[PDB]
């Protein structure tokens, strides 16, 4: 079949640079930054325990509850027990916040509390201060809002107003209450804060409050649980959690577990490898998970991320709330937290606790090796499962805090980093969420590790981070992690993709950031980049060039270092790189290197002139993007030598003269954007301020590549994409059209006189081209490009070429005619441009690319298979443009004074045949050398060759027709014509059909002779016929006379 031929066809001018408009992606407002870091400087521990005396309000049971801070007061005497409990509670708080000033008040007086609060406030005036209260030994707080404390003699409970208490304290502080009616305390505190606010006209949010119970509720009196339940939960969440678990009916699942076993559990709270540390780590992860899942992002950041102590207190507060719910006690927080006892994560917590403690009988008695709990492994597996289908912006996964927790250790660090990188690959929103959760400090600390296996994961993660947010450069410099990236980049064994990512990271680091630029200059980045400058990787070369250009951005030290390393000479090579992106990057780097001369010695002037001359030869570059970068570099050159260019311009109203001529050429560019930029830059010279400097978005455009996902399979490769199905449908239609055309050809050709339609155009039809498969005909006029239909018979679109009046559109071409076709428009001056969305209902005219060529009219012969483009005209040289590389490949000499009137080429062969005005027809073979390209040169006409077409068959016949109207059939393997014919004395235009040997001839007398190669008469249609075209497949003929009338003919 003919499907494989369509499949293996390169799609010219269809890539990221062509489809997507070149520009920088807008940076989102990243609020993930921590606003401030508060510290709990001092801790106040007020213990109104009243050992040995029961408060009159509550008559406790004979057993009652005797455990306060895991100490029995009655065992060691009243004062000794009070002091021991105070010291133990201080130790418990130090377990979470070791660095704090702890001052204990044991049954204090009002004056003592006042003095302590004033002293602590003076110690930390602008920092949070913890005020812990335990009113177990005093009556319940009054509705008026008072707290009972002891007098000097310990004979009467003296009340203490909450208003006075908060008067003594300042704004930044937190409060913890452990009493039966702490809800009353919270309500009174809020009411007094409101009263202060009302008074202020003629400190609520800053204050944080934790309550043991609701105002109506009372503390539990179960003998098994400690009386100091709320504080025990806030201080020893793991111990109280284990004790509470060993009281639930779930112990029936694991018999042989008792409180005695829980007491003798091995391990510490710091050693995570031990069972106790493992439980603590799992509990912290689960509590952070619940907090992030339930609470909103702002409150989550304000509470569980502001400081260590508050985060620990609330992570224990969630467990305290869950435990207290089972005893009809509702802990209360000043910022109202939505209830979290019902969250499913507590089931995972219970499962992990049961699994971990099931091994304790063997650990203590038999003494087995404690196996690590698989909880984190299972959670990471669930995160991976989510990532597998989590392409859509569905609900965020619940395991991001779990990933953050796993990143701390080493047992699962590599897998966690891999999964986090995969998650960040999803898109900018995922990376923003990861920044919100607080992954930045830990991934920053990961740079200190010297493990070489972490280098690819770390560089990928940081590449995504810098792609999303650019402010991390300062933090990277502060950590001195740029050395890590330099080491990664300076490793040839590292794969090219990760080295490209490292280069991108370093380029972002030094992006308009002086400190980073000089840090990397100290880091010998120029030499490292030069070492990996010629690496066989276009993306790597482009990004290394971008980074090198960014390093010397307004930094003379880097410029001098590059001069020592001769970076300019080594970078001249990339100007000829096949990839246009690499050429653009190199031009950007050279322009930036020029822009920071800052009036150095004559060596600087000489090297700058050399760079200018080297950049001057890139005018004949097909890519307008590279030409726009040339314009930016030349603007740098101008701003360096404004006086010289002003003098040169005033001269015309020898280096700067050539640069000014180059700027004139750039101004008269077919691309409107580049022409506008060049014209604006030139006008800035005339009226001679800094505002005239224009920076292209090429840098951020390239940076956007790392924002987009990469790890995923491309849509094109997928078999079931709608795009692939549409392409297959178009291929099937093309195959059917080809088969029908072949069937029509085999049946023969009959007389063609049917006129499908007759319409009038605003302008004279210059050249007409049919779309090979879709029914769209391109009719080019003097100042417009008309697109008609030979089936619907309606006008679709009316374009404007934009060329000057003197110039004229000579030819036309349909690039990628198989599917997603483009329109090639070649003017007679050299302006070649590409049109897209030319005959679509919901899209407007679009210009993909444009570039001046060369510099009869202009002749073009597109070759889709090889992707080569050739333009010819008055110049004695035939240029071979490569659309893949946007550069001329060969410039064969024509060896004739006359202009090239027509040109054609043979598929799968180098049989470039070019007609000439003198009458001679040359043929060139590009396989050999340029001087040997010419093969045959036979001269059998003296007139302008109307059309020197060539048949696509292997036995290609050159049917040359001149103005004399005499037909001669030449062959590439013969020095003389095989058939000679004379049809019309005066011929104006002619067209041939490769499939059907139908030579359509014109005539000044409205005659349209359609003969054969042998000269057999077929049709002489009776109406300056200057435009005829034949359909590539169907035997369709369009004839246009001097009048602006268009017709399409068909064989019945």
């Amino acid at each position: 079949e003919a499907d494989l031929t369509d499949w293996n066809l390169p799609l010219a001018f269809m890539k990221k640079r062509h489809c997507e408009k070149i520009e920088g992606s807008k940076s989102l407002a990243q609020s993930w930054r921590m606003k401030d870091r508060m510290k709990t400087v001092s801790v106040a521990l007020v213990l109104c325990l009243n050992v040995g005396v029961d408060p009159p309000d509550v008559v406790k049971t004979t057993p009652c509850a005797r455990l306060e801070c895991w100490i029995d007061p009655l065992s060691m005497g009243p004062q000794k027990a009070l002091e021991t409990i105070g010291a133990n509670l201080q130790k418990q708080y130090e377990n979470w916040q070791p660095r704090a000033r702890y001052k204990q008040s044991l049954d204090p007086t009002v004056d003592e509390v006042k003095k302590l609060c004033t002293s602590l406030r003076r110690n930390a005036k602008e920092e949070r201060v913890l005020f812990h209260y335990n009113g177990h030994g005093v009556p319940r707080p009054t509705v008026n809002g008072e707290v009972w404390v002891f007098n000097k003699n310990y004979t009467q409970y003296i009340p203490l107003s909450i208003y006075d208490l908060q008067t003594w304290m300042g704004s930044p502080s937190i409060f913890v209450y452990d009493c039966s009616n702490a809800g009353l305390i919270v309500k009174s505190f809020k009411q007094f804060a409101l009263q202060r606010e009302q008074e202020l006209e003629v400190s609520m949010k800053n204050c944080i409050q934790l309550a043991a119970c609701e105002a109506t509720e009372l503390l539990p009196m179960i003998p098994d649980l400690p009386a100091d339940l709320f504080t025990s939960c806030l201080t020893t969440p793991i111990k109280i959690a284990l004790r509470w678990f060993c009281m639930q009916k779930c112990v029936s699942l694991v018999p042989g577990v008792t409180l005695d076993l829980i007491e003798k559990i091995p391990g510490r709270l710091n050693d995570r490898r031990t069972p106790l540390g493992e439980l603590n780590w799992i509990f912290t992860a689960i509590t952070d998970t619940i907090a992030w899942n339930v609470l909103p992002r702002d409150l989550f950041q304000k509470l569980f991320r502001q400081d260590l102590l508050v985060a620990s207190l609330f992570r224990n507060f969630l467990l305290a709330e869950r435990i207290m719910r089972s005893y009809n006690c509702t802990p209360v927080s000043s910022p109202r937290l939505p209830p979290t006892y019902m969250h499913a994560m507590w089931q995972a917590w219970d499962l992990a606790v049961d699994i971990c403690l099931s091994q304790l009988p063997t650990i203590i008695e038999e003494g087995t090796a404690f196996r690590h709990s698989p909880f984190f492994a299972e959670q990471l597996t669930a995160f991976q499962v989510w990532l597998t289908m989590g392409v859509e912006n569905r609900n965020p996964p619940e395991q991001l805090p779990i990933v953050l927790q796993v990143l701390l250790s080493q047992v699962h660090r590599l897998r966690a980093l891999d999964l986090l990188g995969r998650f960040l690959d999803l898109g900018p929103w995922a990376v923003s969420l990861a920044l919100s959760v607080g992954i930045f400090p830990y991934v920053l600390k990961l740079l200190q590790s010297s493990a070489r296996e972490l280098r690819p994961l770390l560089v990928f993660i940081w590449a995504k981070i810098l792609a999303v947010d650019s402010s991390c450069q300062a933090d990277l410099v502060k950590d001195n992690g740029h050395k890590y990236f330099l080491s990664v980049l300076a490793d040839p064994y590292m794969p090219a993709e990760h080295r490209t990512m490292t280069a991108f990271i370093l380029a972002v680091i030094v992006n308009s950031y002086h400190t980073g630029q000089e840090a990397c200059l100290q880091g010998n980045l120029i030499a490292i980049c030069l070492e990996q400058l010629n690496d066989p990787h276009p993306l790597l070369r482009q990004w290394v060039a971008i980074c090198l250009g960014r390093i010397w951005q307004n930094f003379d030290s880097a410029r001098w270092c590059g001069v020592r390393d001769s970076a300019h000479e080594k970078l001249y090579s990339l100007l000829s790189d096949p990839i246009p992106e690499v050429r653009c990057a190199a031009v950007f780097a050279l322009g930036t290197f020029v822009g920071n001369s800052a009036e150095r010695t004559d060596h600087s002037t000489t090297i700058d002139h050399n760079v200018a001359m080297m950049l001057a030869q890139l005018v004949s570059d097909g890519s307008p993007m590279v030409r726009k970068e040339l314009v930016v570099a030349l603007s740098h050159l101008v701003v360096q030598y404004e006086s010289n260019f002003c003098t040169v311009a005033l001269q015309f109203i020898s280096v700067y003269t050539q640069i000014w001529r180059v700027l004139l050429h750039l101004a008269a560019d077919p691309y409107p954007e580049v022409s506008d930029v060049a014209m604006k830059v030139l006008n800035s010279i005339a009226y001679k301020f800094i505002s005239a400097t224009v920076q292209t978005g090429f840098c951020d455009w390239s940076a956007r590549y790392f924002a987009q996902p990469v790890m995923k399979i491309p849509e094109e490769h997928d078999l079931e994409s709608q795009i692939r199905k549409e392409r297959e449908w178009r291929f099937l239609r093309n195959s059917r059209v080809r088969r029908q055309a072949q069937q029509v050809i085999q049946k023969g050709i009959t007389r063609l006189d049917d006129q499908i339609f007759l319409n009038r155009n605003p302008g004279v039809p210059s050249v007409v081209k049919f779309h090979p498969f879709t029914p769209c005909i391109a009719v080019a006029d003097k100042d417009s490009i008309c697109f008609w239909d030979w089936e619907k018979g309606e006008k679709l679109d009316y374009f404007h070429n934009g060329n000057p009046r003197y110039t004229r559109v000579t030819a036309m071409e349909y690039l990628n005619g198989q599917d997603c076709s483009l329109l090639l428009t070649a003017t007679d001056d050299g302006a070649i441009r590409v049109w897209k969305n030319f005959a679509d209902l919901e899209k407007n005219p679009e210009m993909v690319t444009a570039w001046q060529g060369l510099s009869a009219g202009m002749v073009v012969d597109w070759e889709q298979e090889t992707g080569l483009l050739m333009s010819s005209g008055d110049v004695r040289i035939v240029r071979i443009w490569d659309t893949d590389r946007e550069m001329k490949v060969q410039d064969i000499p024509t060896g004739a004074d006359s202009c090239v009137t027509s040109l054609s080429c043979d598929s799968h062969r180098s049989l470039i045949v070019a007609g000439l005005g003198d009458g001679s027809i040359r043929v060139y073979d590009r396989r050999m050398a340029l001087s040997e390209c010419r093969v045959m040169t036979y001269r059998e006409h003296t007139a302008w060759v109307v059309k020197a077409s060539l048949q696509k068959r292997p036995d290609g016949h050159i049917v040359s027709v001149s103005v004399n109207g005499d037909v001669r059939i030449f062959d590439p393997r013969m020095p003389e014509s095989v058939n000679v014919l004379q049809i019309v004395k005066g011929l104006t235009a002619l067209d041939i059909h490769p499939q059907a040997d139908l030579i359509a001839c014109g005539s000044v007398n409205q005659f349209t002779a359609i003969y054969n190669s042998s000269g057999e008469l077929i049709n002489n249609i009776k109406y300056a016929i200057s435009c005829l075209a034949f359909h590539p497949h169907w035997p369709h003929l369009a004839v246009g006379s001097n009048d602006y009338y268009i017709s399409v003919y068909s064989v019945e």
């Binding site: 260590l308 701390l408 080493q410 600390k445 590790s449």
Partner: peptide, 9 residues
């Protein structure tokens, strides 16, 4: 910081 990170070299 907020969480203790071990085994970092």
């Amino acid at each position: 910081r907020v969480f203790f990170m071990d085994d970092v070299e």
